Every structure is written in structure tokens, then in C-alpha cells.
Design a protein around this ligand. Structure first.
Ligand code: NI
Ligand code: NI
Lengths: 8, 107, 106, 7
């Protein structure tokens, strides 16, 4: 994304 | 386990806090496409990363960002967008409160 | 033209489509495409379906009545809608300078 | 898209 975070 | 939405109504959907000035809403998706709203306070950092197997295109819905892709850097404001294809490092830094990126990608 | 790493909206002209609609192809890759679609009040995105791809659209500005397979909602800026392949979808703009950011996998 | 035009 536009941040490092993934969405489990 | 929540089902994807035909209609995403923003003001009816809460934020997921991510910490460090960032929050998001997963908006909707299909097997082939996903859209997420990411909201940044001033100075919040989308740490630079890459995706091995998928592309990403992001729309600046509000506010402004410094965006760096594979060493190129531009200030984007509401209405602008950026592309990061698979394996391209990309990151962002919010320049103002209430800055929002609408991320689209192929999950 | 070549696809853009950075799309700068105010540096990019509109492509006029007729009947109160104009657009900008923003950027694309092999797998994804993003387009800015601008509508006058009352402009109609005629109902249609795509055989082989999905579409998710974000309401960037203004408001729309969106109909998807006979279900109909009024959407305003910040909202979004999903039309998967073979679903009929259309939109009627409810005010000037209404904008949909369309994303799809062509 | 959100209109019936393609490219
Ligand atoms: Ni990313
Ligand atoms: Ni369509």
C-alpha cells in the first residue's frame, strides 16, 4: 500500500 | 471473515488505527481488485516497501504527500496519483493532517 | 502515450467524452488502470457491464446515484462502489463537478 | 468504468 502494513 | 461490499459508505465505516499517525479502512474488493483508504497525520510515514507479485496505483484524495518511488520523489496533492509496479520500492510522507491515499491493487 | 509514475492532475488536460462527461486516464500497468471521470449535474454513465474485468470506483467529489444490478444508492465524496465482471452498473451525477476515480484490471 | 466509454 501507501503504508508498509499488510491486511490479513 | 467480513464480506466485501457492493457500496462502501465512508461515514458509516469506522477507522482501523494502525499507530504512528496512520489509520485505514479496507473499502471493498473482489478476487482481482482491492481498494483501501489510508489516512495520515502530518509527518506520518508510509515506510518504503515493495510488493513482489502485484502492482499498486494510489490516488491522493486529500492533503498532500512526498512520494518516493525507486529513488524519484515528487510532492503530490489532492487529485494526483502514483504508480508502483511489482518490485518497485515506494514510500510516502504526509505533509499535512488529514492527508488520504486511496490504494488500489491486485488482490 | 507512456504510463506515468506520477500523475499530476492540474498538469494534465481533460479528454472530452460528450454529454457532460470528460476524463483523464491517470496511469496504468499491465494489471491495473486508474481513470478520473468528471460529470456535470445530470450527466449519465450509461449502464453497462464488462465481460472480463472487475471495477471499483471511488467518489472523489460531488455525488451520484449509482445502480448496480438493480440496487441503487446515493454516494458522496469518500464513498466507493464495486461492480464485478458481468454486473450491470451505471451512475447519474447529482451535481456539477462530480468525480469518480475508476480502477480496473484491463 | 463509471461511464460507458472505453479507450
Ligand atoms: Ni505498497
Ligand atoms: Ni464500467
Amino acid at each position: 500500500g501507501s503504508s508498509h502494513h499488510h491486511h490479513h | 471473515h467480513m464480506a466485501s461490499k457492493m457500496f462502501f459508505i465512508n461515514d458509516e465505516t469506522p477507522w482501523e488505527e494502525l499507530g504512528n499517525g496512520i489509520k485505514r479502512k479496507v473499502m471493498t474488493w473482489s478476487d482481482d481488485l482491492m481498494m483501501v483508504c489510508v489516512h495520515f497525520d502530518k509527518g506520518a510515514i508510509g515506510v518504503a516497501h515493495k510488493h513482489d507479485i502485484h502492482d499498486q496505483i494510489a490516488y491522493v484524495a486529500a492533503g498532500s504527500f512526498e512520494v518516493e518511488i525507486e529513488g524519484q520523489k515528487r510532492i503530490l496533492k489532492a487529485g494526483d496519483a502514483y504508480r508502483a509496479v511489482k518490485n518497485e520500492m515506494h514510500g510516502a510522507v504526509s505533509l499535512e493532517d488529514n492527508s488520504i491515499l486511496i490504494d488500489t491493487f491486485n488482490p
